[PDB]
């Protein structure tokens, strides 16, 4: 159907400029404008501007002249959002949309995550989380790690029911968080219960059995 | 300079009952937009042109208002409606609204607490945390307190919350005291309390850096 294809997560240090994309396809895209939209985390909706099928056919939101530079390539049917000099006032999740007939922003791009920081690619230490009784919770501990995001799953996801993963928090400027798994106390010790936590900013993948003791 | 204010922050509705948000504006707008969005996803058109429903909307939705204040109505609540509604000026300069969070009311649910010591690889690496699932509980409201040796920590203590399980609705919450090798070390007793609605008495687990 009528598709937004966003470029992929942006990892960049202060004071440096990025450039997004947005690929349109199931239609004539000169036929319709392309807007861009920030989302800072956990906050809510903010317009940046919109582009018309001419480089600087433009429109943008007062505060956003000087931040973001939009571009289309008719040639390909891509709309570019460059970001400059940025700060970590700039980290947030980008989304393009098409303004639509109807006049509303009827479709949109899966959004683009930029993170602004000077911190260095690391991956997690993972540490296991060992309990005690009836349905027993076991956890894993992915810590210190940058950047966002890590994958976690549990028996390679055989064990999907009763899966907690809670969202990472910065610290130090690194982040860390911790996913927990439920389980009859029949089915651990007895049986193998293991977490896998993959950071592909970083290559990394890793494997640790959660064992008795504490 | 038009603003845009959402009404109420956040409210939940059980299933079947009837719900409206308003979006009121400082001055005078035509046409207010709506969207819906759920965590880790893109905005979904919702209402367009103030009362006009999306592709993709179930007519359980209807959308209303003129003027300085609008509204959005959901006929009879359902789980996947849960979600955060923008409302959206229609012109130039296109602002969105804060956004109301819609959550799906359930019966209580006391949250079931697990303590755990520094795991021995962390240990012989030089490092010690302690972590603390509060999970699946419901009204998200709920405090934890750490306890190490009978006093009371404030610091060092980092918390992250889920937001409503698709499957039964409750809430979780993870706590973690980070602390180094001979921090943890030197005292003996680490205890994490729990106070929720569903009880008058704080929820206890704790174990003891040596025995337990």
């Known amino acids: 159907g009528v598709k937004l294809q966003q470029s992929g997560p942006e990892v960049v240090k202060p004071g440096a400029s990025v450039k997004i994309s947005c690929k349109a396809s199931?239609?004539?895209?000169?036929?319709?404008?392309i807007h861009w939209v920030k989302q800072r985390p956990g906050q809510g909706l903010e317009w940046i501007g919109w582009?018309?099928?001419?480089?600087?056919?433009?429109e943008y939101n007062e505060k956003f002249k000087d931040k973001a530079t939009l571009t289309a390539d008719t040639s390909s049917s891509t709309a570019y959002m460059q970001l400059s000099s940025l700060t970590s006032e700039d980290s947030a999740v980008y989304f393009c949309?098409?303004?639509?007939?109807?006049?509303?922003?009827?479709?949109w791009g899966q959004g683009t995550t930029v993170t602004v920081s000077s911190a260095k690619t690391t991956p997690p230490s993972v540490y296991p989380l060992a309990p005690g009784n009836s349905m027993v919770t076991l956890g894993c501990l992915v810590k210190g790690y940058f950047p966002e995001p890590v994958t976690v799953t549990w028996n390679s996801g055989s064990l999907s029911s009763g899966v907690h993963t809670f969202p990472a928090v910065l610290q130090s400027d690194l982040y860390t968080l911790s996913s927990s798994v439920t389980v009859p106390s029949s089915t651990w010790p007895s049986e193998t219960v293991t977490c896998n936590v993959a950071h592909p900013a970083s290559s990394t993948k890793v494997d640790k059995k959660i064992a008795a003791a504490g | 300079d038009i603003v845009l204010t959402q009404s109420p922050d956040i409210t939940a509705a059980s299933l079947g009952q009837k719900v409206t948000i308003t979006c009121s504006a400082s001055?005078?707008?035509?046409?207010m937009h709506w969207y819906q969005q759920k965590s880790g996803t893109s905005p979904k058109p919702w209402i367009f042109?103030?009362?006009k429903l999306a592709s993709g909307v179930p007519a359980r939705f209807s959308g209303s208002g003129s003027g300085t204040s609008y509204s959005l109505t959901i006929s009879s609540m359902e789980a996947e409606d849960a979600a955060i509604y923008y409302c959206?000026?229609?012109?130039?300069?296109?602002?969105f609204g804060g956004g109301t969070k819609l959550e799906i009311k359930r019966a209580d649910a006391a949250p079931t607490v697990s303590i755990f010591p520094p795991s021995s690889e962390q240990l012989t690496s030089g490092g010690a945390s302690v972590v603390c699932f509060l999970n699946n509980f419901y009204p998200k409201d709920i405090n934890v307190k750490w306890k190490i040796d009978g006093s009371e920590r404030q610091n060092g203590v980092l918390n992250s919350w889920t937001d409503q399980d698709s499957k039964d609705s409750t809430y979780s919450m993870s706590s973690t005291l980070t602390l180094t090798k001979d921090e943890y070390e030197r005292h003996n007793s680490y205890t994490c309390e729990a106070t929720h609605k569903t009880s008058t008495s704080p929820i206890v687990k704790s174990f003891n850096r040596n025995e337990c």
């Open positions: 949309a098409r303004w639509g007939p109807h006049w509303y922003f009827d479709v």
């Open positions: 199931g239609y004539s895209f000169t036929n319709f404008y």
């Open positions: 582009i018309f099928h001419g480089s600087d056919n433009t």
């Open positions: 001055s005078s707008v035509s046409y």
């Open positions: 042109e103030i009362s």
């Open positions: 959206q000026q229609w012109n130039y300069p296109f602002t």
